[PDB]
Amino acid sequence: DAYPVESEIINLTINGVARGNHFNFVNGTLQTRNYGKVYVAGQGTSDSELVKKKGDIILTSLLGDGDHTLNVNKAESKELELYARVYNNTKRDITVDSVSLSPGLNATGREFSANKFVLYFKPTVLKKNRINTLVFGATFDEDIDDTNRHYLLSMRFSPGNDLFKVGEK
Amino acid sequence: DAYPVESEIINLTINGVARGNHFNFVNGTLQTRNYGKVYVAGQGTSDSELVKKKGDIILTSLLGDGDHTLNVNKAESKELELYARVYNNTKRDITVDSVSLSPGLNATGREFSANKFVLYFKPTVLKKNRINTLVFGATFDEDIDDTNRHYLLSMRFSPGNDLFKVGEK
Amino acid sequence: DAYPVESEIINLTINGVARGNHFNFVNGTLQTRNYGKVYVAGQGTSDSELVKKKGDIILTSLLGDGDHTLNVNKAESKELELYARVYNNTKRDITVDSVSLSPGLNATGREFSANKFVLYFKPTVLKKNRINTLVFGATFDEDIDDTNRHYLLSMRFSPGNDLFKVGEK
């Protein structure tokens, strides 16, 4: 139903998963102003289930080996990937322009992990009426475990599908 | 008077303060397109003074111990917190979606501090007709002192108060 | 022809250049929704050539010594600068609010450089009917060479020229 005409930031929660070298969504919902309802399904939701969820944009993070566009070193838990399936059921193509991460607060409620990282992200078009792959990588200084796995994810959504077209050499 | 309907980036200047482990605003003003006038009062402005300033959104950074939502290691000056009071006197709730930092130029005018850091920030609603607490943390590799304390702060403002609602386990 | 009234993110590709300590654009074009056509000319395009290109906003990155607002250590290739000339041929002033970088994928197509960096950027007004200097710096942990030089650049454009005005001491 939604026909977006402006950019908007989508703020979601995610956790690192050592086994599989993945990021994993926290399930829940988010009412946006321009993109309808964002529905974050449970982990590993299949494509046929994903298109039945009650929202305008449906996301699931996938776990387990093979769900990787990136060579992570599975011998450690420093190199992590979000491998997400995103159902765009709005009336327009959406570009995910950029992402950023902040660590969440740990158990104390008053400290955050200062585990430094490099973020990998390439702008990604979410075609409408389609389930799309969406990924970002993060490579940390220190292993991700249970003490330091909590992160806050910011994604910028914008209308359309226009991307840089490389010219001649 | 202002009734915002689009997101906007607010660019302000801040300095690290070793004693107290804080960030501190540079006072001044900023004319925005969608959020009226931003007024950055002097440090430690009290709540009753803050609501008398001439602007649509009034900010002050607080210094001195106790003004911390975060356990900073006061034995050093690597872990810093912005503890700000923000008066939203527009006609709508505002969400601060994200922040980012850049070091400013040092005394040479041609170099910047490459002191690496991890930024902590959780999206924060600024309720209208209310003074709100706004914080972010930064944990640096190296101590902040007089040679390397100058920073540029970017905040994204957006209309409304909608946030992620966590679902069931 | 373009009269922008909203902010937009511009996603471009850039490479590090060890000799000269620069970033260098990949030439090409980008259709924006609010800022007309972005035209990225070849490196070192002169000012008289730059204003003849077919676009609404024309950019070139300059190489070679002297094209630096920043003291880079030319003895190594860790400290890099984008020194760009930008022709704003829209009907309004544009502010570049912020920038961010992501490494691109390397030759494997499945790995990215985790070379950590500190980004320097100060908000910059692109005056209309003028060629403007636009710069950002990046200081890396490790030397930039042929294995790790590929980056993705995000710039946020917004209308107008309003900037923070510093108050009295």
Numbering used by the authors:
A (entry chain A), B (entry chain A), C (entry chain A): 40 to 208
Report text from the authors:
White spot syndrome virus (WSSV) is a rod-shaped enveloped virus with a large, double-stranded DNA genome, and belongs to the family Nimaviridae as the sole member of a novel genus Whispovirus56. For the interaction, VP24 has been recognized as a core protein to associate with other structural protein partners and form an envelope protein complex, serving as a hub protein to function in cell recognition, cell attaching and guidance of virus entry. Recently, VP24 has been demonstrated to be a chitin-binding protein involved in WSSV infection.
Lucky, after screening, with the addition of non-denaturing protein-solubilizing agent NDSB-201, soluble VP24 could reach a concentration of 3.5 mg/ml and yield crystals. The inner surface lining of the core is mainly contributed by the hydrophobic side chains from five Ile, seven Leu, five Phe, five Val, two Tyr and one Met residues; the hydrophobicity of the core is quite conserved among VP24, VP28 and VP26. In the crystal, VP24 forms a trimer by crystallographic three-fold symmetry axis. And the trimer interaction mainly contributed by β strands β1-β9-β6 and β7’. Furthermore, significantly different to those of VP26 and VP28, the N-terminus of VP24 forms a loop perpendicular to the barrel axis, which may pull the protein more closely attached to the viral envelope, compared to the protruding helix bundle parallel to the barrel axis of VP28. More interestingly, the electrostatic surface potential measurement of VP24 structure reveals an electronegative surface, owing to the presence of residues aspartate and glutamate residues at the top of β–barrel core (away from the viral envelope), and a highly electropositive surface at the bottom of the barrel core, distinct to those of VP28 and VP26.
